[PDB]
Design a protein around this ligand. Structure first.
Ligand SMILES: COc1cc(OCc2cccc(-c3ccccc3)c2C)cc(OC)c1CNCCNC(C)=O
Ligand SMILES: COc1cc(OCc2cccc(-c3ccccc3)c2C)cc(OC)c1CNCCNC(C)=O
Lengths: 124, 125, 127, 124
């Protein structure tokens, strides 16, 4: 049936850098945006809400405003790519991509953030 | 849009008894089973996967073998009801019902388990 | 060797009741209160700091001020007993009794709180 | 009014490096050895049990075989430092320096371990 795959299970990112975490899902022919729903979260906090082809920033959690985006152009190749800028220590943890596309599945990804001491002190 | 609702997001449960935790979803006219997908999990342990009209016990966690049931009758009422038999202390925690039915959503339900000393001491290892 | 000991390391208590958690330490002759130090703590919130007979009220968490006390009567019997009145769901978790009395040791104790749905609903939404 | 004190609350150390976590206490006049118990632990695990001038390594936890040692000549200066060799990701977490010396206190130290991708991938 329908399966979301994560080739990369684990991301190790430096404080302040960028990360793009990815989930694959089968697109047989052209992509039908009307039947596609892509939800991204970490630890119950909403990051991405993609329905009928568009982002909805209504329940996007405070700490991800203007740092996170779904790369709409990857969707046609069957890649839900969540791009996050200016990574913080609070971004470490488990993420989840939930995809509904004539079928539905989700996977998790684990993010680890390395940081020097000054950033680590402020987050303590 | 498509909203999953939970009438109770907190259940309090006596050890060893049975519980049914519920998630409601919109059913327009008559349920189309072909278009319905339901996952029930707790803390990343899969309990139920329901696809194409049947229960998938594929990545089910072993502590839910023969204890966890989805009431199929209630799906046609728009009610994804998870029944868990003989509740144990390890059943305490956060549950997720994930529902795809032309649209998609999920809700969390917290289950608290009360137990007397004898059960609690055995769970203590 | 100085061995702090615990008769129950597991307590199961109902919401709203009172609990007394016991820690025992050897007292061979008469109690020398000047050499006794008792700390009671719950997941790094300090509940009692008892030094040389004086209960330190500098660092008692707001959560336990008004509800926790050390039973001074049992000290010369070799018992450092923490009493918590009107148990709340917040009280559940691992406690430590740390004792310095010519030597030093500590023990952990796990506390589980049962509560009716009504108390559980209050804590779930408003704690 | 004996008080244990730590120069720094937080350590950020690299995987595979060596770490000394420092901890201090009242010793104005010197230097009765026999009134001294030093106990180092990490999240319930015993690392260091110092009494009467020697470590007793019967309670020492298995993950600290050959890697944890107290450096005993600086206690005279009021310094009880725990040395950890070949820092592993397992070593991240909250440490406790417990000292009884005519009085008793203890202080917490948090350790965070940065590691490259290839090190993080095992575990995961
Ligand atoms: C937690 O708030 C969510 C979560 C969403 O996950 C959707 C999702 C996507 C892909 C797949 C799945 C899914 C996976 C496995 C089984 C069943 C379903 C889901 C579960 C989608 C969401 O809005 C589209 C919202 C937010 N709104 C909640 C109610 N209002 C609306 C407009 O809806
Ligand atoms: C948990 O095994 C410990 C823990 C120890 O903490 C020592 C310590 C050091 C300095 C201070 C303190 C302390 C701090 C604040 C207030 C009161 C006391 C402690 C508490 C010291 C220990 O041996 C010196 C041992 C081993 N005890 C052997 C008995 N074994 C059993 C099973 O029964």
């Amino acid at each position: 049936a329908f399966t979301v795959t994560v080739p990369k299970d684990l991301y190790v990112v430096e404080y302040g850098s960028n990360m793009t975490i990815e989930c694959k899902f089968p697109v047989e022919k052209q992509l039908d945006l009307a039947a596609l729903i892509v939800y991204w979260e970490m630890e119950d906090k909403n990051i991405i809400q993609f329905v009928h082809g568009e982002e909805d920033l209504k329940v996007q959690h405070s700490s991800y405003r203007q740092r996170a985006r779904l790369l709409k152009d990857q969707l046609s190749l069957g890649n839900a790519a969540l791009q996050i800028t200016d990574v913080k220590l609070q971004d470490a943890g488990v993420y989840r991509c939930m995809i509904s596309y004539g079928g539905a599945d989700y996977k998790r990804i684990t993010v680890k953030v390395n940081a020097p001491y000054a950033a680590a002190l402020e987050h303590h």
